[PDB]
Amino acid sequence: QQMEGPAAVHYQPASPPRDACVYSSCYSEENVWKLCEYIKNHDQYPLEECYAVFISNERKMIPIWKQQARPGDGPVIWDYHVVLLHVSSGGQSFIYDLDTVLPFPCLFDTYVEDAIKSDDDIHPQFRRKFRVICADSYLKNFASDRSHMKDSSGNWREPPPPYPCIETGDSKMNLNDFISMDPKVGWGAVYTLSEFTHRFGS
Incomplete structure (x- = not known):
């Protein structure tokens, strides 16, 4: 027997169920954006508890396991992939990946263990970085x-999502600032896999 801060055993998901979410294949940066918009307009959780997480590397070749585009035990190699991270008030983190076969949402430790896995035995040019x-x-x-x-x-290359392009008053296109894992570019923080799991893992 082994025992286990506080547990989110009664965690209420911050999103609608998987099949009820806005989703376009190969547009996960927009799929996550629409989740952030929902959380903002829903008055359930503070938006400050949530993060968009870009996964990529310098060569834009990252494996992700447990992906719907490749059912089975093999990985999908993305140029980049975006998920939603919710750090619940007790400290337990959850991953919202509309493209995973793992639960939606998934406990952070489980998603890191099954979808991401260790970089230690991965050829270094495939290793993952997180913005x-x-x-x-x-x-x-x-x-x-x-x-x-x-x-x-x-x-x-892939049919676009059925709503107008996401725009701001400052830009019509800064996606490369988010895929980049250069900490001197863009917003947020860039982590290695160890830094990422040290930060949000329990």
């Missing part, structure tokens, strides 16, 4: 004109 942006800052500053999703001849 953590406050959901309030994310809603206030993120902009994407989706131009990165046009193909060789100006057609869509």
Whole structure:
């Protein structure tokens, strides 16, 4: 037997159920944005408890396991991937990944163990870095004109989401500032996998 700060055994999800969420494949930066917007307009949790988390690396080649685009025990290799992190008031963190086969939401430790796994036995060019942006800052500053999703001849590589492009008064396109893992660029903090789990893991 082994015992276990406070536990969120009665955690109420900050989002609608998985099948009720706005979702477009290969637009997880917008899928997470729409979750932040919901949390903002819903008056359930403070937006300051939530973060958008960009996962990528310098070579833009990151494996993620337990992904719906690859059912089974193999990884999907993304150029980048975005999830939502909710640090509940007791300290327990939850991951909202509309693309995972793990629960939605998922306990932070479980998502790190099954979806992310250790970088120790991963070829170093595939190792993951994390940019953590406050959901309030994310809603206030993120902009994407989706131009990165046009193909060789100006057609869509993936069909876009069915709502207008996310815009701010300051920019129509700063997605590269979020995919970048350069701490001298953009908003939020950039962490290695160890720093990320040291920060939010229990």
